[PDB]
Symmetry: C5
Subunit: 148 residues, 5 copies
């Protein structure tokens, strides 16, 4: 990914610190690997707080990465939180015509979330995937706009 | 320690299951007071359905809003459609108004679950406190972001 | 509740008249007991039709009450109607900054809906609850905005 | 019981029917058309689309220049989750349009688990229900109601 | 019996699960070509989540857009929120821009199910072709409705 021009925002929640930090770390790695060593990084408490800050960043950034973890608890809370946050991320991308890379984990168990958080032992790095998605899409959009 | 003395906070709390709602509200006030806000705008409504229009009304004139209430599953699918609509209303408003909305609306299957989350002396969790900490920390973050432009 | 100064709209479906008529009657009684003797009352056939009428009422009233019933049938239709209507009522309340009391029942059985329609044998009066909801919240907003 | 019909002769009506599962779609359209004629509208604007996913955008086009729109079609659950997401988004979409355009949208989009359920709701000679008829009634009655309110 | 020669067609296709994505795109291309459109605008993105923002970009300057891709259920609820939110986004865009968006985003439980709907030699269905047909035929309908 050659992403040197671009302004990247990263919004990462903090609930389940270890997972969130590792999501952040993976997002940062891909950004750095793509020419962006200093993305705008912001932290929030939980996933619920992510949309409003992703919105704030999207208005002044070419791309934003949304990072966090929701693990199902005892109640239906999980279902309404995951649906609303994910749909909020879709809205902001459309409203602002800016890609929002979705690295917000929605898992039934902790081990699932750990297995996707880009730790040494993880099957996947969702932080990295979200960053690649945000950046690659922003480049494509910049290419489309720079025509006619 | 959150220092929010500069900020205007609205709190809307439903009244359906008053023991729980009152405890959610008490947990929110405490965080606010502990954060330097002794006098937030507090408004009561009947049930969860009523919360969003008032959250909007408050979000327009406040830096942060906390939405508190409880919906407990009964016999019918009513639970599902209320929880989903209210929750998405709270998301819509925060985005429309670029104002954090702390979600302390409990959506439980049983009453014991709600009580266990209401920040009563016996409760596992204090959802009103978490929803106030969420809203205030987010508003200070937004404030910081906007002071850079 | 003193709501004398407030303009109130009520939209009630007519599908399943035992249920719908009883919901409307419970809402009317709250409105009357709150000092609103002449609310704008509008009937529609089914629940799907309630949103566009609620929207129309909300634009010229201080509160609106939505009443009807969706009972689950054989197909997923129930799920998509209840969700879409319910979310529509939320949209309208927000768009118009006017409360919309939700008295649209969404039940699995007809017996559940009867038991919520505020007939003399009913455990609950959801028309009454929807009306108190809309009117108390309207007074609250009035107060806030003053 | 005999009850006089809706008089909607002063109204402009649009009808959009999809085509997937065409004998069912055609039957919905015919039931809707019957009710429109009975109500005084022999020439509604009738438009056909491929599937239910195509219904919203056309319903919107019609809603801008008509007093009522009828939305007709069929989704039958298949193998995959596609049914759920399609049904939800289409139904949501019809709700959004009615609000955006303050114009009623009569919902005759069947969303069934089986073909037999759809057939039984499509107003065929042998059908239990005529959801096309129902959807046309809803849109037209609601439209007259709105006109009545707007005179106030 | 689709004559869209005079129409502007945009196609967005994700990349995740290449074989299927590529076949979906070949299916839509073939339909466009047969309908008189030999140079559609074709954009590639990483995954389903990235489809709507690009579909929006194209819908603003095209008479029709085709959205193509595949989401296959894995271990967590991620599938349900991505599917609901993408499908809802495509519906939103079509309405916002009054421009048809053909939906060729597969949402499946299994890989075999996706492969069976991707328009491969032995596939039961050609969802790319179906999405292109949908978008183009609806585009013509709107053109007629607007004509006088
Ligand atoms: Na931007
Ligand atoms: Na504000
Ligand atoms: Na009003
Ligand atoms: Na109209
Ligand atoms: Na366009």
């Amino acid at each position: 990914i050659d992403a040197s021009g671009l302004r990247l925002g990263i919004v990462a929640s903090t609930w389940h610190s270890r997972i969130c930090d590792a999501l952040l770390a993976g997002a940062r790695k891909v950004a750095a690997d793509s020419g962006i060593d200093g993305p705008t990084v912001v932290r929030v408490l939980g996933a619920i707080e992510i949309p409003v800050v992703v919105q704030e960043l999207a208005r002044h950034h070419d791309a934003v990465v949304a990072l966090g973890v929701v693990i199902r608890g005892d109640t239906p809370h999980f279902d309404y939180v995951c649906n609303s946050v994910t749909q909020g991320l879709t809205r902001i991308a459309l409203d602002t015509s800016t890609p929002v890379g979705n690295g917000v984990l929605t898992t039934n168990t902790e081990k699932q979330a750990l297995d996707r958080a880009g730790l040494p032992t993880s099957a996947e790095d969702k932080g990295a995937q979200a960053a690649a998605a945000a950046l690659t899409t922003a480049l494509t959009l910049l290419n489309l706009r720079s025509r006619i």
